[PDB]
Amino acid sequence: MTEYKLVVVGACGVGKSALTIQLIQNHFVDEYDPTIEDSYRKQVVIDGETCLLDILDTAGQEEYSAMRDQYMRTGEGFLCVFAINNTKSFEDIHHYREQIKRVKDSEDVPMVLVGNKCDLPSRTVDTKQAQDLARSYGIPFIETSAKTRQGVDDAFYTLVREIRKHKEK
Ligand SMILES: Nc1nc2c(ncn2[C@@H]2O[C@H](COP(=O)(O)OP(=O)(O)O)[C@@H](O)[C@H]2O)c(=O)[nH]1
Ligand SMILES: [Mg+2]
């Protein structure tokens, strides 16, 4: 069956693990060690296609930089997560965008921009500013809450659709 290798990246504390575990296990985790990096796999149906998602929940630095380069080269699509109450996490998106393109040595890399924690009242990044950044990259932007599940399926399924568009060229 078709497999899609997805990689979730973003600053520590933005909800990468919470988003991934909501997609896979359908519950919100209040506490998950920020240093744990692991992969999950789930069979889903997306637009009538039965497919396997293989998702890497990243945790930042690796023992050796060759490990980072390896998962970036093998990953097919990237979910670039910031938190709407953490401006620094939004500014760090520039770094992840650049680093992924550099390792892949490609200008066209399937990517979706995710603004997580949309259930919280505190917001430092308004939607407009994130839409402006996504428009500059030519990629979709989705606001999510790993707590309420709002937008979670859409974020991951939209990324799969971006991969499919990249592949048909
Ligand atoms: N309220 C709220 N809290 C969240 C959300 N996503 C993650 N969190 C919390 O934010 C903290 C960090 O999330 P985590 O998934 O560990 O972030 P990671 O470092 O990117 O993996 C945890 O305390 C989670 O409970 C969300 O959508 N809403
Ligand atoms: Mg984590």
**CATH code, domain carrying 25:** 3.40.50.300
Residue 28 near residue 146 (C-beta atoms within 8 A): yes
Ion ligand 2: residue ranges with CB closer than 5 A:
16-17
The amino acid that residue 107 corresponds to is: E
- What is the per-residue burial (b if ≥16 Cβ within 10 Å, else e) of 50-68? ebebbbbbbeeeeeeeeeb
CA–CA distance, 33 with 93 (Å, rounded to integer): 22
* Longest Cα separation, the chain: 42
Residue 167 near residue 80 (C-beta atoms within 8 A): no
CA–CA distance, 3 with 51 (Å, rounded to integer): 6
Q: Report residue 29 as tokens.
A: 């985790």
Say which residue the tokens 């859409």 belong to.
154
Strand 111-116, strand 77-83: pairing:
parallel
Measured from the Cα of 14, ligand 1's closest atom is: 20
32 Cα to the center of ligand 1, angstroms: 8
What is the strand order of the sheet 77-83 is part of?
38-46, 49-57, 2-10, 77-83, 111-116, 141-143
Exposed / middle / buried, residue 26 (Cβ in 10 Å: 0-12, 13-18, 19+): exposed
List all residues 6 or more positions away from 25 whose beta carbon is below 8 Å from its beta carbon: none
Host H or E run for residue 128: helix 127-137
Say which residue the tokens 């990044």 belong to.
125
Torsion angle, alpha carbons of 87, 150, 59, 14, to 10:
20
Residue 103 near residue 136 (C-beta atoms within 8 A): no
Q: Report residue 65 as tokens.
A: 């930089």
Ligand 1 contacts CB of residue 89 (under 6 A): no
Resolution in A: 1.4
CA–CA distance, 156 with 81 (Å, rounded to integer): 12
Pick the residue whose CA is nearest to atom 8 on ligand 1. Answer: 15
Task: State the ligand closest to the CA atom of 145.
Answer: 1
CA–CA distance, 143 with 113 (Å, rounded to integer): 8
Measured from the Cα of 144, ligand 1's closest atom is: 27
Say which residue the tokens 């500014």 belong to.
91
Ligand 1 contacts CB of residue 16 (under 6 A): yes
Domain count, the chain: 1
The amino acid that residue 74 corresponds to is: T
Strand 2-10, strand 49-57: pairing:
parallel
Q: Report residue 127 as tokens.
A: 């939607």
CA–CA distance, 140 with 114 (Å, rounded to integer): 9
CA–CA distance, 8 with 41 (Å, rounded to integer): 13
Residue 20 near residue 57 (C-beta atoms within 8 A): yes
Residue 4 near residue 79 (C-beta atoms within 8 A): no
What is the CA 31 to chain-centroid distance, rounded?
19
Pick the residue whose CA is nearest to atom 28 on ligand 1. Answer: 117
CA geometry: angle 149, 83, 115, nearest 5 deg: 60
Domain interval for residue 36? 2-166
Strand 49-57, strand 38-46: pairing:
antiparallel
